Write a protein that binds this ligand. Structure first.
Ligand SMILES: CCCCCCCCCCCCCCCCCC(=O)OC[C@H](COP(=O)([O-])OCC(O)COP(=O)([O-])OC[C@@H](COC(=O)CCCCCCCCCCCCCCCCC)OC(=O)CCCCCCCCCCCCCCCCC)OC(=O)CCCCCCCCCCCCCCCCC
Ligand code: SF4
Lengths: 215, 56
């Protein structure tokens, strides 16, 4: 990676011990963070490795638009990392191990925040559409399954599905994950898994609204 | 049955039972030859999840 290559001369000049003095053990150094989405001051900043998420957001991004209580979910490490709700983001550290313990993973340390005034399902479906348009199509699991999940999420956004299809989509994501040539399939299955795990009531309520309004 | 009463009593006495109670020729008591459409439910393996064939 560009950052990995760029930090090496400084590591050599200042010594590895100085770089290891930052962060936690197995999580040493400093990281570049990209905060985007629903913050007052989206920005790119370099900060100590195991920084708390809320402290990072408040000190650098100016806070969440409408306050911290207005926060709904955060994508901490780019589109390939599963989302976490506000409760997890309250006391979560920004490093590999602690974010894996949160079932997310650090990824590229790209923080995408979402307040309570936005459609989480629509954003996840947009990410799945991005993965559908970016898959190379070499292997059948990624190609066919990601197209399938794109269609399923498009139906989910309108509520045109039935509640029994949420588990079917979860099983499809399980089938895609770990069975592809590269990690694009994993990076497409994970956002769906996180969205289901943390917002199944939202999907069910959307489906029932569609069911009553269409009879 | 379009049988007169005298013949009815004669056959009842000859056989020794009551025959109009149990007749051997079908009449309007049978079902209609035109029936409403059915629905025919599905089996237990028609689930959308947790339905891997290796487990059944
Ligand atoms: C015996 C003398 C003739 C009369 C007769 O047989 O009546 C028997 C008639 C028999 O009734 P059943 O056949 O049990 O009942 C069915 C209906 O009568 C069913 O009645 P149906 O609607 O079929 O009637 C058709 C009608 C017309 O039938 C015909 O034209 C064809 C048969 C011609 C036969 C000659 O039958 C007749 O008029 C001829 C009756 C017998 C004539 C001999 O009733 C009686 O007269 C009993 C009298 C006591 C007998 C001992
Ligand atoms: S998983 Fe990777 S290799 Fe397979 S089709 Fe998708 S992008 Fe291509």
């Amino acid at each position: 990676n560009v950052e990995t290559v760029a930090v090496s001369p400084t590591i050599c000049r200042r010594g590895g011990a100085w770089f290891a003095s930052f962060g936690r053990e197995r999580n040493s150094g400093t990281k570049l963070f990209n905060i985007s989405g629903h913050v007052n001051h989206p920005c790119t900043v370099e900060e100590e490795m195991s920084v708390p998420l809320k402290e990072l957001i408040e000190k650098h991004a100016g806070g969440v638009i409408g306050g911290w209580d207005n926060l709904l979910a955060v994508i901490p490490g780019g589109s390939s990392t599963p989302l976490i709700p506000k409760s997890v983001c309250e006391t979560v550290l920004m490093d590999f191990d602690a974010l894996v313990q949160a079932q997310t993973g650090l990824g590229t340390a790209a923080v995408i925040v979402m307040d309570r005034s936005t459609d989480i399902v629509k954003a996840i479906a947009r990410l799945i559409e991005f993965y559908k348009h970016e898959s190379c199509g070499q292997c059948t699991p990624c190609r066919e399954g990601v197209d399938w999940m794109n269609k399923v999420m498009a139906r989910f956004v309108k509520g045109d599905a039935r509640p029994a299809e949420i588990d079917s989509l979860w099983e499809i994501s399980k089938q895609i994950e770990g069975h592809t040539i590269c990690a694009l399939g994993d990076g497409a299955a994970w956002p769906v898994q996180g969205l289901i795990r943390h917002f199944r009531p939202e999907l069910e309520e959307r489906m029932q609204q569609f069911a009553l309004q269409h009879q | 049955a379009s049988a007169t009463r005298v013949i009815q009593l004669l056959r009842n006495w000859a056989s020794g039972r009551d025959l109009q109670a149990k007749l051997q020729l079908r009449y309007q008591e049978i079902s209609k030859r035109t029936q409403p459409p059915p629905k025919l439910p599905v089996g237990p393996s028609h689930k959308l999840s947790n339905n891997y064939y290796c487990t059944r």
